[PDB]
Amino acid sequence: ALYEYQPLQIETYGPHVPELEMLGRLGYLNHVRAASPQDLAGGYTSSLACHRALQDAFSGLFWQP
Amino acid sequence: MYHNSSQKRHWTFSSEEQLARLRADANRKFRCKAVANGPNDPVFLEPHEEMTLCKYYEKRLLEFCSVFKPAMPRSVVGTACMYFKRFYLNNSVMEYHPRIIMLTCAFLACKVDEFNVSSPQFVGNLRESPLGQEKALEQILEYELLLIQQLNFHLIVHNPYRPFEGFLIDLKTRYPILENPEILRKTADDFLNRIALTDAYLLYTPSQIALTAILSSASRAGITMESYLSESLMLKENRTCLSQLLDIMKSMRNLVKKYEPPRSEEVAVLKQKLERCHSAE
Amino acid sequence: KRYEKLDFLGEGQFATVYKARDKNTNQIVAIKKIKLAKDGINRTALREIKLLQELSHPNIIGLLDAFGHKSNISLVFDFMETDLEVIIKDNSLVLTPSHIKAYMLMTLQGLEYLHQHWILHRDLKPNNLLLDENGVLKLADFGLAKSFGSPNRAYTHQVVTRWYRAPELLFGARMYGVGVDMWAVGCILAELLLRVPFLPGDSDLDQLTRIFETLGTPTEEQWPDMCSLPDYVTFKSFPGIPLHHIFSAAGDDLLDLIQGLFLFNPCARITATQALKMKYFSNRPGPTPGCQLPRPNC
Numbered sequence: 001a002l003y004e005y006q007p008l009q010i011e012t013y014g015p016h017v018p019e020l021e022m023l024g025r026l027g028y029l030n031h032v033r034a035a036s037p038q039d040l041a042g043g044y045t046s047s048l049a050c051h052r053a054l055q056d057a058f059s060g061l062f063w064q065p
Numbered sequence: 066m067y068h069n070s071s072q073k074r075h076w077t078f079s080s081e082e083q084l085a086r087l088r089a090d091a092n093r094k095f096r097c098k099a100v101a102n103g104p105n106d107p108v109f110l111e112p113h114e115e116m117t118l119c120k121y122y123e124k125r126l127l128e129f130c131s132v133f134k135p136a137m138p139r140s141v142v143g144t145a146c147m148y149f150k151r152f153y154l155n156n157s158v159m160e161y162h163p164r165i166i167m168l169t170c171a172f173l174a175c176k177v178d179e180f181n182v183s184s185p186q187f188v189g190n191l192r193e194s195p196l197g198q199e200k201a202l203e204q205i206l207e208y209e210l211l212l213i214q215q216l217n218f219h220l221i222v223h224n225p226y227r228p229f230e231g232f233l234i235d236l237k238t239r240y241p242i243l244e245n246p247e248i249l250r251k252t253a254d255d256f257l258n259r260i261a262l263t264d265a266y267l268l269y270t271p272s273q274i275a276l277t278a279i280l281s282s283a284s285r286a287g288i289t290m291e292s293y294l295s296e297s298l299m300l301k302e303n304r305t306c307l308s309q310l311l312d313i314m315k316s317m318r319n320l321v322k323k324y325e326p327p328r329s330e331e332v333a334v335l336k337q338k339l340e341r342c343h344s345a346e
Numbered sequence: 347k348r349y350e351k352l353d354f355l356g357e358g359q360f361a362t363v364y365k366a367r368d369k370n371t372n373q374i375v376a377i378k379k380i381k382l383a384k385d386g387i388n389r390t391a392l393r394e395i396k397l398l399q400e401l402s403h404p405n406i407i408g409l410l411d412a413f414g415h416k417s418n419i420s421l422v423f424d425f426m427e428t429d430l431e432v433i434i435k436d437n438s439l440v441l442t443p444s445h446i447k448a449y450m451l452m453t454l455q456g457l458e459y460l461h462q463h464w465i466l467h468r469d470l471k472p473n474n475l476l477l478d479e480n481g482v483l484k485l486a487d488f489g490l491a492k493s494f495g496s497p498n499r500a501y502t503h504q505v506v507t508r509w510y511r512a513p514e515l516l517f518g519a520r521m522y523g524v525g526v527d528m529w530a531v532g533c534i535l536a537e538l539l540l541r542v543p544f545l546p547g548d549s550d551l552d553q554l555t556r557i558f559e560t561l562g563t564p565t566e567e568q569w570p571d572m573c574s575l576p577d578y579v580t581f582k583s584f585p586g587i588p589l590h591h592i593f594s595a596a597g598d599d600l601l602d603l604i605q606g607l608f609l610f611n612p613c614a615r616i617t618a619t620q621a622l623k624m625k626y627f628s629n630r631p632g633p634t635p636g637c638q639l640p641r642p643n644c
């Protein structure tokens with residue numbers, strides 16, 4: 001009867017997108033502007049911009065109609 | 066996101082030959098209307114003439130968007146230009162006049178991209194009298210449901226601009242070979258504008274477009290970025306994919322080469338022809 | 347058009363909703379006709395159209411159609427038999443732990459998908475959680491939903507119906523992430539537990555009062571940059587009632603879930619994915635299979 005977690009498997013058709021918490025160690029976040037305190041305070045980090053930008057770059061890159 | 070979007074699904078096409086078949090039938094469908102409404106007369110535009118007209122009025126759509134105040138997101142403009150392209154895949158410029166529809170396209174796109182501007186500040190950007198400006202508003206409001214209907218209510222447009230910022234993040238991070246990938250910007254941005262004048266936006270994905278733009282810029286800059294596509298995008302591993310990507314990015318460079326702008330003389334005569342359809346019908 | 351209005355179901359602010367049957371097919375549908383006069387088609391009918399054509403998930407409402415004339419547009423959805431607020435305020439219904447598990451599961455799965463596709467719902471509350479007659483919960487009312495993750499993009503507060511509004515949105519934060527849906531998920535959980543609105547304020551400052559009375563006034567430790575939000579006015583150091591005193595029927599699994607949802611830091615507030623991987627959902631008992639969830643016979 002138990003529910004068991006299993007991630008959403010959504011085919012992005014391009015390169016591997018690095019994990020949101022990995023972005024600061026993989027060094028991506030040096031290449032977006034820092035979120036300011038008010039943005040941070042609202043739950044808005046620079047990692048969100050970076051993560052979305054990278055996903056936008058890699059989405060559909062190896063798709064053909 | 067692009068990979069499950071309506072853009073991918075219904076609005077990205079397998080070749081220019083598919084597009085020409087849509088536009089051919091869009092002109093043909095009209096002629097049966099105007100023949101029933103009226104005769105195979107010389108008043109009617111040919112599909113290539115409509116392509117000149119759509120190419121002309123798309124450059125007017127970009128004028129209106131470049132001189133627009135407050136200012137305008139490229140997102141809004143790209144969405145407008147995309148609606149303009151998409152409108153004119155299944156509709157004839159002789160039923161819906163492109164001057165109107167280009168403003169219905171900017172109007173719907175201002176709303177859909179959540180860019181705040183009201184009906185008075187909107188038509189306040191038309192170089193007309195307040196009579197003409199408020200006449201324009203009536204036609205914009207009459208056509209706005211028709212625009213949305215012919216878009217099949219697929220109002221989200223995935224533009225190359227966010228992809229383009231993604232590749233710039235990536236190249237600075239994990240291709241230190243290109244010591245400053247920022248310099249590729251203006252040229253890639255210029256190339257994007259040119260890709261936008263072609264059918265590329267109905268043919269390639271936003272990312273493929275943004276990548277072609279960046280690499281076209283790097284090649285023009287005397288930089289080779291083979292090790293970026295092979296190593297970093299991991300097609301040193303998957304081989305059939307590296308060829309397929311290069312076949313896509315090179316098919317796009319051909320479009321920006323085999324594009325010719327609207328000729329002013331042709332545009333003048335074609336506007337004449339168009340307005341004789343629109344005084345009637 | 348090809349629909350016959352059968353019954354009036356309600357008013358939103360922006361629309362009035364009716365049961366119809368589409369003559370072509372055995373979908374009973376909720377048509378949400380928009381109400382009006384020179385701005386064109388309503389920006390809220392567009393907002394729902396633009397966002398719902400893109401998403402597809404069993405725990406998000408399926409936009410079937412749209413249609414109209416001039417500036418006046420219908421949006422058409424599957425008719426849902428009930429909603430979560432009706433279930434909450436039905437005194438004869440008993441919400442067992444499995445039942446509360448089964449609703450909170452579906453909310454979080456719907457919301458996991460939604461956040462993955464970079465959209466905040468921004469109006470989560472129990473009447474915006476519709477439940478069908480097969481017992482799947484779907485998020486509905488996308489009319490205030492917005493995409494996030496854009497740095498150069500100011501958003502508004504006054505999103506969420508005050509009672510389910512997160513303290514960063516009561517402090518009027520311009521930029522915000524998924525925390526604004528996660529707080530509302532906490533407020534909906536608390537309401538499935540208590541059967542009354544958890545924090546029923548009646549000014550935006552009476553909302554911050556009832557949050558801080560109940561969950562304690564946030565320290566800087568619990569919210570480092572709270573202070574830089576525009577409307578940040580300092581409060582009395584309200585004690586906070588410990589969560590097992592509020593929800594005394596809860597087990598430490600569920601109290602960990604609830605706690606994670608109510609974190610003041612909108613960055614530390616558990617995401618929908620983090621939430622689904624907590625021991626609460628995998629622990630015994632298992633979530634009620636949607637077929638067995640309680641159906642209000644009026």
Ligand SMILES: *[C@@H](CC(=O)Nc1ccc(C(=O)N[C@@]2(C)CCC[C@@H](Nc3ncc(Cl)c(-c4c[nH]c5ccccc45)n3)C2)nc1)CN(C)C
Pocket residue numbers: 355356357358363376378407423424425426427428429432476486487642643644
């Ligand atoms: C006996 C008598 C009885 O009580 N019967 C009832 C009571 C209520 C309903 C009913 O229709 N309830 C609602 C109105 C509850 C909210 C959701 C409604 N369905 C719906 N489906 C899709 C959409 Cl998009 C919407 C929708 C979205 N926003 C709104 C705002 C307001 C209203 C609707 C909205 N709604 C269903 N049915 C029966 C009962 N016997 C013994 C069964």
